[PDB]
């Protein structure tokens, strides 16, 4: 995996350049954001399980059929597996928030998601809907909390949405 600093370093090493003023500026921006990154990660760690439970309790009301017959969370086994996927999404989103880069997100989440979910027959739309529900809950809780900077939180979840979402248009 690569965080923002490592991805910048790799980008500059690609051209074989020394770290210039723009590199220093990007590094300074990340290093100043690091306080809010750690704060948001601590908050999401504090409220993790509750966040995923509430996100599922909203998503199964948005699309009720995932718990009715022929739905993909019908059994308690399927329900627990779905909640496990949601917890995985939250944990890797937290890792990506701390790292300030979505490559750790890609290498360990998205790179085969459609293949695995298609093989298991899991829908690929409700999952991103639940992802966005988690992101909304996370950002609402952050806004309620004393987090001066919270814009970066939408980046990991939105990248997950863009990658794992079917290209509708």
């Amino acid at each position: 995996m690569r965080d923002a600093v490592t991805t910048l370093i790799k980008n500059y090493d690609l051209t074989g350049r020394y770290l210039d003023r723009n590199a220093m500026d990007e590094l300074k921006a990340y290093f100043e954001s690091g306080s809010a990154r750690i704060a948001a990660a601590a908050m999401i760690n504090a409220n993790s399980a509750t966040i995923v439970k509430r996100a599922a309790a909203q998503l199964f009301e948005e699309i009720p059929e995932l718990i009715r017959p022929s739905g993909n969370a019908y059994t308690t086994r399927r329900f627990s597996a779905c909640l496990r996927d949601m917890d995985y999404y939250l944990r890797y989103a937290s890792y990506a928030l701390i790292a300030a880069d979505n490559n750790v997100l890609d290498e360990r989440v998205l790179q085969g998601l459609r293949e695995t979910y298609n093989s298991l027959g899991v829908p690929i739309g409700p999952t991103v809907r639940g992802i966005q529900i988690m992101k909304e809950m996370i950002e609402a809780m952050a806004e309620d909390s004393s987090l001066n900077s919270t814009d970066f939180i939408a980046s990991p979840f939105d990248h997950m949405t863009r990658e794992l979402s079917e290209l509708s248009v």
Partner: protein, 149 residues
Amino acid sequence: GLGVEAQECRNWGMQQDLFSYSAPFRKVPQFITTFAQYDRPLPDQHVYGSGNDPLEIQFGAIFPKETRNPSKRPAPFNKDTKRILIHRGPAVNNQVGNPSAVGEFPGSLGAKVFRLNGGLPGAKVGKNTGTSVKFGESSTQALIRAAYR
């Protein structure tokens, strides 16, 4: 397997293909190739799969058989994904960057071009019958045989 433990969603198809008894017959490494392809961008490959690209030989629709020596290399090709094709003629003549040069002919850089440039024999009544040595008919015979080829 899938039920024995937790399966990471990064080597799903790879391990699915590996566990089956047909594993020792796919000789092409399906693990290193996909692991590199994740970090690399989209490959030079047909939209619907690697097996869907015929060999670039003179004749014969030689395709990689999906079941014989398994070498399928699926890639996520969306709709609006134009391919990069190397022009036979001059590189400047590629219609991607030279859209008005489609009719250009590849002089000495591409394959030969066949046209009905010469008048077909018997086109006009100027050759009033006879004329067994009416010169332009080998050209049209070569044109027809070249269209066949």
